[PDB]
Amino acid sequence: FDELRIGLATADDIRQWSHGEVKKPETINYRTLKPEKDGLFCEKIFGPTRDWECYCGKYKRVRFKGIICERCGVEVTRAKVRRERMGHIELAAPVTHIWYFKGVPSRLGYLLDLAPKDLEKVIYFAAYMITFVDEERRTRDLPSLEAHVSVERQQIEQRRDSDLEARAKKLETDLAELEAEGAKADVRRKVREGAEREMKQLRDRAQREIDRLDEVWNRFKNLKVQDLEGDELLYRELRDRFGTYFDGSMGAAALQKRLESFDLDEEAERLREIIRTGKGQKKTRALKRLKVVSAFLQTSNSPKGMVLDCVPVIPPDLRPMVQLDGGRFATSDLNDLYRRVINRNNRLKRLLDLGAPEIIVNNEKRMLQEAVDALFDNGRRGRPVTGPGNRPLKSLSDMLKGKQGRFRQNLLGKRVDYSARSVIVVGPQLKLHQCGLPKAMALELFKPFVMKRLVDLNHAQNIKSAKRMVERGRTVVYDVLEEVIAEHPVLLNRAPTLHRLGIQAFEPQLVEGKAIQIHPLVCTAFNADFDGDQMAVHLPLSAEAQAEARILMLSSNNILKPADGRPVTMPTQDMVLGLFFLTTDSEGRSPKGEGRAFGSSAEAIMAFDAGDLTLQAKIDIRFPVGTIPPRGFEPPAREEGEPEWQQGDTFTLKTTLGRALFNELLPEDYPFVDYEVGKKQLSEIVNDLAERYPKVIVAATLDNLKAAGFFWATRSGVTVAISDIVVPDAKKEIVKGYEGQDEKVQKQYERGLITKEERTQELIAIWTKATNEVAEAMNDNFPKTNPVSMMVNSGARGNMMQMRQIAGMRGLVSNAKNETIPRPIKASFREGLSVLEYFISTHGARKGLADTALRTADSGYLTRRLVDVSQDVIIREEDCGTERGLKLPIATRDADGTLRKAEDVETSVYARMLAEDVVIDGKVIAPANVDLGDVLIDALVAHGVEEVKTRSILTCESQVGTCAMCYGRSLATGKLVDIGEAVGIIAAQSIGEPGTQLTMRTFHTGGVAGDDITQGLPRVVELFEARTPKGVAPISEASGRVRIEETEKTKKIVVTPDDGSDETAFPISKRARLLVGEGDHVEVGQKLTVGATNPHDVLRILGQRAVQVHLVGEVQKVYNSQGVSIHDKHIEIIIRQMLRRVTIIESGDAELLPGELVERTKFETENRRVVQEGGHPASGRPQLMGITKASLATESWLSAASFQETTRVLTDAAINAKSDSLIGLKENVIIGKLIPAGTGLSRYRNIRVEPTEEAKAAM
Amino acid sequence: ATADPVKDYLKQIGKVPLLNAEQEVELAKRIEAGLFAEDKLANSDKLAPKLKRELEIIAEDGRRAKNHLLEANLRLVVSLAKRYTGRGMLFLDLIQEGNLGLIRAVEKFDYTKGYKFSTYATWWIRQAITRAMADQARTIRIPVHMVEVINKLARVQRQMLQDLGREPTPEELAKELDMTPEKVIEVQKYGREPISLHTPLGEDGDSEFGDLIEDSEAVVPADAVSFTLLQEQLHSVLDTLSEREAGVVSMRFGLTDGQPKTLDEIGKVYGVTRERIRQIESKTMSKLRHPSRSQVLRDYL
Ligand SMILES: [Mg+2]
Ligand SMILES: [Zn+2]
Ligand SMILES: [Zn+2]
């Protein structure tokens, strides 16, 4: 389990694994249903089908286990041994493996210098091959064979001359006799014409016999190894004419005979020689050939296994034939493929037994080879073997691949026991850490524990009686159930589970109904909505699992979302509206009892219950001792003649009753919050509470906030009648004026003075102006009292666009294929659309639905790719010895006379760590190795700093992984990241979580294609794939003079760098936009055409820091366009995992291949060991590569096998004979060992616990 | 060399010379020449080496003529194998098995019957093709006589269906074929084709038919827990009884070991009569049959 090897399995290994020969094709008997002898499903080879029974019906008893039956040879043992015992099929003629031959040429490898079409010709029995030639023996006796050929030519010419003389005599004789007989007037001309026709035909066959002799001579003269011969007649006449000189064969046996004598070390030698000198695509050919051949040199596995003689068989359980109801049978397609191979092998053996024609034997060997190929890969070549006539049979590989393969459907993700699922309901009566399971769910989940406690409580005599009562379901079972499930957490989980908070451990609690009762305060972190969403409940089982549920997983410890550090367990739908109504100012609502002193909040509550004081009214309310005053009230303390402090003393405040209640919700140590709460300030309050109070106190305060928010939202005066939604009264006249001027334009267009396109453009412009103006009128119309504004201005639920298109006009709405109708929807949803206006609304609606479906699909795909590329990076050191960092800006866009901090400081500089101390006047403002929060950043920007050096992960160098300090504080705990936290998966999920939340598509292309770059999720995936964007913006290599060259066929730009640097020319199309000055000043910074720069050349000509900044800035500017906030360290992790590979050149002294994928640490180690040897180091360039290519090119082939290309990497590992170290997480999920992240580390599992001496002395 | 080797095989047949009557009778005479010559060579008698080489030349010519007859007759076997295609066996495999039938056919030919090769070869072609179809087409092997019985029953059932236009009762088919109706039920139960395990269910792609079936051989954890608790409780109730009674019951059903022992078998080591040992045995069964020591075992069945 330390190491998991792979390689080519030669026939010796197959025979070692095998336990017999599957000689016969049949599987089971047709009446007794017993497995056959020495055939498929054989009990002698694979093992018995029952337990400790044998085939011949004897030896049914268990006592004499491990013996061999004399009658039938079946070993008596368990029935599960048929899951692990394999045999083999002995093939009469060798066949090739379809994985290596007929694949990617990087894995075919050109090990023999043959074209793939030549292989198709040779091993599919359509063209011959010469396997061996006695070249030195052929060249030794050249004068003798030349003399024999000369003798043959001489006798050919002699017999031609004799035949010519005889034909001349015959022609003269017949001409003389037909001119002397005089049978006809011109019969001599006819016989002469016939004679000359005979002349030309016999001369033709003479030149033809000469031609075949010449062609066989020049064919034999240039015969060598690796020679093919398509024509069977030509090879036959070489065999007949010339003997024991060249050896050839037919089919895959030719490859075996070539490979047994194939000399490959000198092949690598001369191939290195042609690597050293040459030019062109020959370099690439020899490069791939040397990268494949050198695998067989260093490794000890012989290359014999590419062509095979034996075929191992799957054990019979894994290709079962199971009995069903009604007598029907169901078998796997592997049994059918094995049956086909066995039938054809038996028929080939039968043909080899007797004397058979070569065409029939060759066709039999071809169909055998094709059947073996179909067994290894059904559908790789040609029409797949269908079978029933509907679908192709699934081969071995066809279930090692894809969504139906073992890697992705049964190894990474598995079904589980002790799990349950039902719909969800909201329960406000629960705490933060409680969930309500039904009775049936809790009984079926906790059934074995219930039986154990029932036997312990002796309600049942033994286990069977306990099970009988549980199945019957008596009330004592429910009582002991309620006694059991407490102090036993369960894992709740939603199916999408987009991010880390999709699994949260609650404490179960018995409730009635058939639905899981769930705290509303946490349902937004699940993305849960109570509309039939079904949540599965998984049960942690051992002590370790429920301990990790209690400590790591509890719902009262997951306040802060790891995506941005913002609180996520304070939802907004209903409680925020209640607190808004509780704490808002009295505007538009009649304030009763406005401006009267109150002794305490109790007297105010009594007055409010009486009815003479409204909830929001500016009153002077005195507060008892211990209440902390507001942040703004401490300096404006009540004026004092003697020295006094208002910090712990009583005070009077000008605040409403509702704010006093709200500060009764918050803890006593919190300062009196004295403003409109809404949502954003509530998020800030919850963030401050989480940052400055322990977890249990924060859970209690949010539970109080939930309860009071619901209580006051019931009485908040929100409701939606149709009078509450109000249309602007000015909308009628605004629309009337705009349609009047539209009518004026329409009669203006009717005269043809303007085109249709210009009219459409100006019409959509003026109608956009109209909808913006009526939106402004709508904002100016509504008061603060109506509930729609009260639930949209409080951050509760809704945006201003929705209220704009319910009250005001719906505005402009798109057509099919992304254009705009000149006529907008002038009717509001309160007024109600007309027929066709509603039709054009449906145009946009269905496109939006299809867009969000495809968007969530591609978001899941990007999330998976990010998880693969960004995994196996884990915090593994406490601190580095480094001091280098990143120059992240802190103060930007300062005005005249003032300094302003950066706008995106909250996602970039926050939650990081300083690389070194900062000084402005010789004194440190912020110490090194501390987090950067609000107060410290405010102090720095007040002192007058412009940029800071943050110790980020891109500059982190370490012996293994990354350290905690260089990564920065974790955004999910609010503290420093613990050693072992799997930061890579958290980063990948945080990038992939708002993929469905982007909801972006290009509104209009402007009538031209290609002018607009990719937007939204396609832009993000194009950035992370390191691909060249669709809008390419070239960058000048050096500063110099740049001018345009407007060639008519294709535009052209030319930049001439100064200082004697070489001219570089960039090709640009005849497209509309180019922003560079002709004969103007240019440098490396700017871009010749506005567009997305290709980041490959950015890295090439600017540096690693510049390309890191560019990538981070681009993805963050995509994400910030929608409102989703992702911290930049999550991107920086993927970018660091992205630039790790380095491309090397001129590696003539570093003794490895130049111009491939080389790891950075390995390249540095090679440089160190070659400068230790004295040789000059090889050059190297960093290579920005995509997430997919970096995921495939990994050390552990199990992780790459679990990814997309699972056939290429398996063949690659088999050829390279690479064994993977099990450092990683996919390769530890598959095996079932503990993952090396978090609790699974070595430094945590190696603890020994013992009580102290005074502890055992006490008891 | 490309896909669809059926086309490649058909072109590999090539433009073989079709044989008019005198040509194939001359070829058959050359077959006999080669065969009788190699038969003469097979004898151990010593002849002239030149005569031996001449007979070897005749044998080579006979082998060449046998080959030429094969490539001449691959056309007829392809034309006949297509008559029985698309019935669970591949077309080229049918061609190859018909080729086996044809090489069996020509070996058993004589020129005494002045008939064409078609009317004699077609019998062996049909016989070998239907024998291979009986032997190898189905996943479960069915013997050839069962196959001919079942497809004769199928064809006469089809004749009944096209005759009276209705599905006949199995009793009518049994009495019109003179077998018992239970035999007819048995043979149409045997004549069934298995359905592949990997059939898709519907719109969903990941859900296959193979994951829906359970296995009866799978161990149930409840059953194993019940078994080990039954063993523990049986040991406990054995310890509850007297030591001598526990000893005598431990051997009567051979509880201690894997083998039970008779009353005469234990009458030597302990030394009592058959009367007394069976009396104390039946007393132990009666004592365990009392309802006091029953609830600890009645639910255990
Ligand atoms: Mg939902
Ligand atoms: Zn046996
Ligand atoms: Zn570090």
Q: Which residues contact B98 (CB under 8 A, 6 or more apart)?
A: B77, B78, B80, B81, B125, B128, B129
Least Cα distance to A1133 among A1021, A889, A904, A967 occurs for A967
* Tokens standing for residue B279: 């009396």
* Tokens standing for residue A887: 């120059």
Asked whether the beta carbons of residue B300 and residue A462 sit closer than 8 angstroms, the reply is yes
Measured between beta carbons, the chain B residues lying within 8 angstroms of A79 are 217
Q: How many CB pairs under 8 A join A and B?
A: 148
Same domain for A741 and A630, yes or no, is no
Same domain for A658 and A773, yes or no, is no
Asked whether the beta carbons of residue A463 and residue B229 sit closer than 8 angstroms, the reply is yes
Same domain for A610 and A704, yes or no, is yes
Asked whether the beta carbons of residue B103 and residue A79 sit closer than 8 angstroms, the reply is no
In A458-496, which positions are buried (b, 16+ CB within 10 angstroms) versus exposed (e)? Answer: ebbebbbbbbebbeeeeeebeebbeebbeebbbbbbbee
A956 marked ligand binding residue: yes
A-chain residue closest to B143, CA distance: A30
Rg, C-alpha atoms of chain A? 42
A966 marked ligand binding residue: yes
Ligand nearest to the CA of A67: 2
Asked whether the beta carbons of residue A359 and residue B205 sit closer than 8 angstroms, the reply is no
What are the backbone dihedrals phi and psi of residue A1035, each rounded to the nearest 5 degrees, phi first? -120, 135
Q: Which residues contact A246 (CB under 8 A, 6 or more apart)?
A: A130, A132, A133, A134, A138, A223, A238
Same domain for A812 and A695, yes or no, is no
* Tokens standing for residue A192: 């002469």
Residue the block writes with tokens 């509603």? A838
Domain with residue A747: its CATH number is 1.10.132.30
Report the gap between the CA of B67 and the closest CA in chain A (Å): 6
Same domain for A712 and A734, yes or no, is no
CA pair distance B279, A256, nearest whole angstrom: 80
- For residue A335, the surrounding DSSP H or E stretch is helix A333-353
Ligand nearest to the CA of A56: 2
Helix, strand, or coil (residue A24) = strand
Size of chain B in residues? 301
Tell me, in Å, the resolution of the deposited structure: 3.7
Asked whether the beta carbons of residue B103 and residue A30 sit closer than 8 angstroms, the reply is no
Q: What is the torsional sign of CA A753, A758, A760, A763?
A: negative
Measured between beta carbons, the chain A residues lying within 8 angstroms of B87 are none
Asked whether the beta carbons of residue A121 and residue B213 sit closer than 8 angstroms, the reply is no
Note whether A401 and A380 are within 8 A (CB): no
Same domain for A604 and A711, yes or no, is yes
Concatenated DSSP letters of A1068-1137? --S-S---PPTTEEE-SSSBSSSSEEPHHHHHHHH-HHHHHHHHHHHHHHHHTTTT----HHHHHHHHHH
Which member of B196, B215, B296 has the closest CB to residue A461? B296
CA pair distance A65, A70, nearest whole angstrom: 14
Measured between beta carbons, the chain B residues lying within 8 angstroms of A358 are 67
Residue the block writes with tokens 């004699």? B120
Asked whether the beta carbons of residue B300 and residue A367 sit closer than 8 angstroms, the reply is no
Note whether A594 and A586 are within 8 A (CB): yes
CA pair distance A470, A46, nearest whole angstrom: 42
* Tokens standing for residue A319: 């290709």
Asked whether the beta carbons of residue A335 and residue B3 sit closer than 8 angstroms, the reply is no
A896 marked ligand binding residue: no
Report the gap between the CA of A118 and the closest CA in chain B (Å): 9
A126, A1182, B245, B282 from B241: Cα distances, Å? 85, 84, 7, 14
CA pair distance A533, A569, nearest whole angstrom: 19
Report the gap between the CA of B135 and the closest CA in chain A (Å): 9
Measured between beta carbons, the chain B residues lying within 8 angstroms of A236 are none
Residue the block writes with tokens 């310890």? B239
Same domain for A641 and A747, yes or no, is no
A921 marked ligand binding residue: no
Same domain for A656 and A768, yes or no, is no
* Tokens standing for residue A730: 């000015």
Experimental method: cryo-EM
Note whether A393 and A386 are within 8 A (CB): yes
Which member of A36, A126, A328 has the closest CB to residue B195? A328
Ligand 3: centre distance to CA A968 (Å): 9
Number of neighbouring beta carbons within 10 Å of residue A231: 10
B-chain residue closest to A365, CA distance: B96
Which member of A127, A329, A363 has the closest CB to residue B194? A329
Question: Best of A50, A322, A381 to disrupt the B interface by mutation (most B CBs within 10 Å)?
Answer: A322
At what angle are helices B21-42 and B49-81 packed, to 10 degrees?
130
Give the domain range for residue A817.
Answer: 729-850
Helix, strand, or coil (residue A928) = coil
Note whether A1073 and A1051 are within 8 A (CB): no
CA pair distance B58, A326, nearest whole angstrom: 63
Asked whether the beta carbons of residue A354 and residue B103 sit closer than 8 angstroms, the reply is yes
Q: Where does chain B have alpha helices with state H? A: 5-13, 21-42, 49-81, 91-107, 117-136, 144-164, 170-177, 181-190, 221-240, 243-252, 274-288, 295-298
- For residue A970, the surrounding DSSP H or E stretch is none
Note whether B260 and B253 are within 8 A (CB): yes
Residue the block writes with tokens 């820091």? A1105
Same domain for A669 and A760, yes or no, is no
Instruction: Provide the greatest CA pair distance for chain A.
Output: 168
What are the backbone dihedrals phi and psi of residue B99, each rounded to the nearest 5 degrees, phi first? -65, -40
Same domain for A711 and A739, yes or no, is no
Measured between beta carbons, the chain B residues lying within 8 angstroms of A465 are 299
Least Cα distance to A1224 among A871, A707, A726 occurs for A871
Same domain for A597 and A625, yes or no, is yes
Ligand nearest to the CA of A531: 1
Same domain for A586 and A697, yes or no, is yes
Ligand 1: centre distance to CA A513 (Å): 20
Ligand 3: centre distance to CA A957 (Å): 6
What are the backbone dihedrals phi and psi of residue A331, each rounded to the nearest 5 degrees, phi first? -125, 150
Torsion of CA A881, A886, A892, A896, to 10 degrees: 70
Domain with residue A603: its CATH number is 1.10.274.100
Which member of B2, B140, B208 has the closest CB to residue A30? B140
